[PDB]
Paper text:
Subsequently, the phosphorylated threonines in Emi2 can be recognized by Plk1, which undergoes phosphorylation, and these phosphorylated sites serve as a recognition site for SCF, another class of ubiquitin ligases; SCF destabilizes Emi2 and activates APC/C10. In this study, one of our aim was to elucidate recognition of Emi2 by the Polo-box domain (PBD) of Plk1 using X-ray crystallography and biochemical characterization. To elucidate the detailed molecular mechanism of recognition of Emi2 by Plk1-PBD, we determined structure of the complexes of PBD domain (367–603 of Plk1) with peptides Emi2146–177 or Emi2169–177.
Because we could not identify the binding mode of phospho-Thr176 in the structure of the complex of PBD with Emi2146–177, we crystallized a shorter phosphopeptide (Emi2169–177, containing a single phospho-Thr176) with PBD and solved the crystal structure of this complex at 1.8 Å. In the asymmetric unit of the crystal structure, two molecules of Plk1-PBD bound with the one Emi2 peptide, respectively were found molecule 1 (shown in blue in Fig. 2D) displayed the whole sequence of amino acids (169 to 177) corresponding to Emi2169–177, while molecule 2 appeared as 172HKTSpTI177 of Emi2. This binding behavior is different from that of peptides from native proteins including cdc25C·PBD24 or PBIP1·PBD25. As far as we know, ours is the first report of natural peptides occupying these hydrophobic pockets in Plk1-PBD. To elucidate characteristics of the possible protein-protein interaction site in Plk1-PBD, we mapped sequence conservation scores calculated from the multiple-sequence alignment of various Plk1 homologs onto the surface of Plk1. The two interacting binding pockets, such as the phospho-binding pocket and tyrosine-rich hydrophobic pockets, are located in the middle of an evolutionarily conserved region as shown in the structure of the complex in Fig. 2D. Especially, fluorescence decay of Phe169Ala mutant is minimal compared with two other mutants and wild type Emi2-mCherry, indicating that Phe169 in Emi2 is important for degradation of Emi2 after pathernogenetic activation. For example, Phe169 of Emi2 is located in the middle of a Tyr-rich hydrophobic pocket; this seems to be the first report that a natural peptide binds to Tyr-rich hydrophobic pocket.
Author numbering:
A (entry chain B): 173 to 177
B (entry chain A): 368 to 593
Amino acid sequence: KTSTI
Amino acid sequence: EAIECHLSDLLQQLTSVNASKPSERGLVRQEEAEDPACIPIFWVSKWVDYSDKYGLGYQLCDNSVGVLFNDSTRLILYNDGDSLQYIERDGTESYLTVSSHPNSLMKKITLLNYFRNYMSEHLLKAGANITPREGDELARLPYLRTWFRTRSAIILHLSNGTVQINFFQDHTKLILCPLMAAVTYINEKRDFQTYRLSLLEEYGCCKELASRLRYARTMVDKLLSS
């Protein structure tokens, strides 16, 4: 779960 | 601390702006609230949520990197790749180097490096087209004081007063700073603009910023209540 790719 | 103090100031500023119902004017003049000088020095450009096991890693726009671990401690690596800062739960800070780092910080430094290697390989940089404001030569970095995620956004609270809200559905972003009493809005087109909150109250703004500032009010209240 991360910020925008 | 002054941190608690800056949360109260942001809340008051947002409450004032929203109370004025900025999107409800005879003629909204949002352009009159533009203050490019008020662009933030720091914001979060990338983050990785590994809170199931360790915590949340992030990168600031200056390419420095931090972790807020699940035990409410923070490790921050400067963009020179050697300067370190450890911040304990109660805010106590220690200045270190990866060269001379205490053995006790082995595991956390290894985790910081995991996040560091991941982010420089995976994610887009938020506000990449934005040139930060300034701050003095040898200044210390802020750290992530707290964060949380809702269905609509991830909320990030920096120790320098800044609150950042990244909205999940359309990738719009708000960077709020009580010191400047300003807000930076990053549109879905990654276009951006910085507004003085007092002038937004004076001249009004569009429905989409107004809406986001209402949610921002709710979020800053949540930060304060916790």
